[PDB]
Every structure is written in structure tokens, then in C-alpha cells.
Amino acid sequence: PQVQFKLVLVGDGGTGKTTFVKRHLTGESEKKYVATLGVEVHPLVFHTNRGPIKFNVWDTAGQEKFGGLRDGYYIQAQCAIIMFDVTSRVTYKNVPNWHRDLVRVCENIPIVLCGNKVDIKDRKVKAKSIVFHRKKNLQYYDISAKSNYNFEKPFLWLARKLIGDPNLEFVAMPALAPPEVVMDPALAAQYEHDLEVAQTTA
Amino acid sequence: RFALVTEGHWDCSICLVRNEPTVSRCIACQNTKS
Ligand SMILES: Nc1nc2c(ncn2[C@@H]2O[C@H](COP(=O)(O)OP(=O)(O)O)[C@@H](O)[C@H]2O)c(=O)[nH]1
Ligand SMILES: [Mg+2]
Ligand SMILES: [Zn+2]
């Protein structure tokens, strides 16, 4: 049997959770539908310098738009990604609510915070806002699901925490759906610069 | 090499959660061990 972790992917509706998990082509073709809970489980394999790791990513069927998710969705979650939309401030405002629900049923599992849709010029939630409200034990990454931008970074960070190996590496990128929008390198360089300065600011 | 290491423990065929040998229903999705 294989090394695998249940990863719960939560965040407001419309933030791009489904679009994001679907970039992993094999995880999409081999996804599994849980009828009793309305969940699609995507087995995402990543190949590390110490062998393969599987993140079984639990993706909702939209139920988050109307209320809290049932406990079964969170049970045995070993890691999580909280997603919000950089073009919608309310999705960031709700991040602590998702955090609370995770810690209630899962406690101190490793968690990554992802701001999605950074490919859009008219960004609203910027590096200053996210780094000002940075919470310890909560790594953050800019991501753009439609462009595959930074796709592997949440999973690499989680794998290091879960394995307890700061030197874990992915030896190759997984097969990803080809980008549907271009991530302008200038925006990427800017948002990356804005994030570094905001983190090393005195 | 330090390759990652992997008895009645069973993986749910439906949702892939690993379950204890003591249980017969999946603790997460409540489906029964095949
Ligand atoms: N420009 C851009 N649009 C995105 C991105 N991710 C999602 N969108 C769109 O956001 C809408 C909701 O996407 P979805 O994956 O269903 O979010 P979910 O409700 O959290 O699962 C859709 O119209 C997506 O096409 C992105 O990374 N960049
Ligand atoms: Mg969705
Ligand atoms: Zn199950």
C-alpha cells in the first residue's frame, strides 16, 4: 500500500477550489465520487526524492455555498488548503471561519492558505493585506489555477510538514492541464516582489 | 536510501480513508468495508 494523506480543500464558493484541484490530470481521471457526502476525491500523486506521495484531495460539490459542511468531510483530514479569491475581499474575510471549522474537527493539521486568481490585473487583496494578517503555522501562496501558477507549492510545503523533512523535493512536475490563461510574467514578478518586500519589511 | 515507509487496516474503496480494523463502516463516509 501507498503513502497517502487526506487533504480537505475548503474556502468560499466560487474561489476556484474545483478549478484548482482539476489541474492534476491523473487526479481528475481517477477521481472518486462519494455519494453519501457529495464529495469528489482526487488522488494527486507527486514524486519526491524519497518516493511517491498521494494527496487525496476532497473537493466539494458546491454545498459550501449554503452552509457548513458535515463532519464526515473533515474526518481524518491530515492536511488542508484554505482558498480565497484575490478579486473578492469577502472570501478573504471568511478565511478565519474556515480555519476555525478545521481546527474544531482536525486540530493542528498543517494548513496552507492560497489566494487564487492572481492572473487578473484588477487584484483587490494584495500582499500588504495578507502579510499584515499573517498567522503562524499558516504558509501562504499566490496561485492561479487557470494558469498552473505556483500549483505545486502548497503540496510541497504540506509534504515537508507531514513527512518532517525540510529537504523533501519534487523530482518532476505532475502532468497538468495546459494553461487556459497566461500568467503575465510582469504581474508574477510584481506580486512576488510585493510578497518578499512585505515579508522582509522593517 | 530513506525511501518513505508505508494488518486488518483497510482503505475505503469509496473515499480512500484509512480505517481501523475494529470498525466495519468507514468513519468518514459510513460505507461498509467491501
Ligand atoms: N482568471 C482566473 N479565473 C478563475 C481561476 N480559478 C477559477 N476561475 C473561475 O472562478 C469561477 C468558479 O470556479 P470554481 O472552481 O467552481 O470555484 P469553487 O466554487 O470554489 O469550486 C469559475 O468561473 C472559474 O473559471 C483562476 O485561477 N484565474
Ligand atoms: Mg467547487
Ligand atoms: Zn469512506
From Swiss-Prot, chain A:
Its lineage opens with: Eukaryota, Metazoa, Chordata, Craniata, Vertebrata
Annotated Gene3D superfamilies: P-loop containing nucleotide triphosphate hydrolases (3.40.50.300)
Per the record, the covalent cross-link Glycyl lysine isopeptide (Lys-Gly) (interchain with G-Cter in ubiquitin) lies at 65
> What CDD domains does this protein's entry cite?
Ran (cd00877)
* Record's cofactor remark: Mg(2+) interacts primarily with the phosphate groups of the bound guanine nucleotide.
Q: Where is this region: Switch-I?
A: 31-39
User: Of which family is this protein a member?
Assistant: Belongs to the small GTPase superfamily. Ran family.
NCBIfam families for this protein: small_GTP
Keywords from UniProt, A to Z, are: Acetylation, Cell cycle, Cell division, Cytoplasm, GTP-binding, Host-virus interaction, Hydrolase, Isopeptide bond, Magnesium, Metal-binding, Mitosis, Nucleotide-binding, Nucleus, Phosphoprotein, Protein transport, Transport, Ubl conjugation
Q: Where does GTP bind?
A: 12-19, 30-36, 62, 116-119, 144-146
Official protein name in the record: GTP-binding nuclear protein Ran
Gene Ontology terms, MF aspect? cadherin binding; chromatin binding; dynein intermediate chain binding; G protein activity; GDP binding; GTP binding; GTPase activity; importin-alpha family protein binding
Q: Locate the N6-acetyllysine modifications and list their residues.
A: 31, 54, 65, 93, 128, 153
| Effect recorded for residue 31 to Q | Mimics acetylation; enhances the nuclear export of RELA/p65
| Pfam short name (any one) | Ras
Cross-link Glycyl lysine isopeptide (Lys-Gly) (interchain with G-Cter in SUMO2), sequence positions: 65, 146
Q: Does the keyword Aminoacyl-tRNA synthetase apply?
A: no
From Swiss-Prot, chain B:
Q: Which sequence positions carry the modification called Phosphothreonine?
A: 6
Zinc finger (RanBP2-type) positions are 7-34
Residues annotated as carrying Phosphoserine in the record are 34
Signal peptide limits: none
Which compartments is it annotated to reside in?
Nucleus; Nucleus membrane; Nucleus, Nuclear pore complex; Nucleus envelope
Specify the superkingdom: Eukaryota
What is known about its processing and modification?
Polyubiquitinated by PRKN, which leads to proteasomal degradation.
What is its quaternary makeup? Answer: Part of the nuclear pore complex. Forms a complex with NXT1, NXF1 and RANGAP1. Forms a tight complex with RANBP1 and UBE2I. Interacts with SUMO1 but not SUMO2. Interacts with PRKN. Interacts with sumoylated RANGAP1. Interacts with CDCA8. Interacts with PML (isoform PML-4). Interacts with BICD2. Interacts with MCM3AP isoform GANP. Interacts with COX11. Interacts with synaptic plasticity regulator PANTS.
- What's the domain remark here? Contains FG repeats. FG repeats are interaction sites for karyopherins (importins, exportins) and form probably an affinity gradient, guiding the transport proteins unidirectionally with their cargo through the NPC. FG repeat regions are highly flexible and lack ordered secondary structure. The overall conservation of FG repeats regarding exact sequence, spacing, and repeat unit length is limited.
What the protein does? E3 SUMO-protein ligase which facilitates SUMO1 and SUMO2 conjugation by UBE2I. Involved in transport factor (Ran-GTP, karyopherin)-mediated protein import via the F-G repeat-containing domain which acts as a docking site for substrates. Binds single-stranded RNA (in vitro). May bind DNA. Component of the nuclear export pathway. Specific docking site for the nuclear export factor exportin-1. Inhibits EIF4E-dependent mRNA export. Sumoylates PML at 'Lys-490' which is essential for the proper assembly of PML-NB.
Q: What family name appears in the similarity comment?
A: Belongs to the RanBP2 E3 ligase family.
Q: Which disease is this protein implicated in?
A: Encephalopathy, acute, infection-induced, 3: A rapidly progressive encephalopathy manifesting in susceptible individuals with seizures and coma. It can occur within days in otherwise healthy children after common viral infections such as influenza and parainfluenza, without evidence of viral infection of the brain or inflammatory cell infiltration. Brain T2-weighted magnetic resonance imaging reveals characteristic symmetric lesions present in the thalami, pons and brainstem.
Q: What is this protein called?
A: E3 SUMO-protein ligase RanBP2
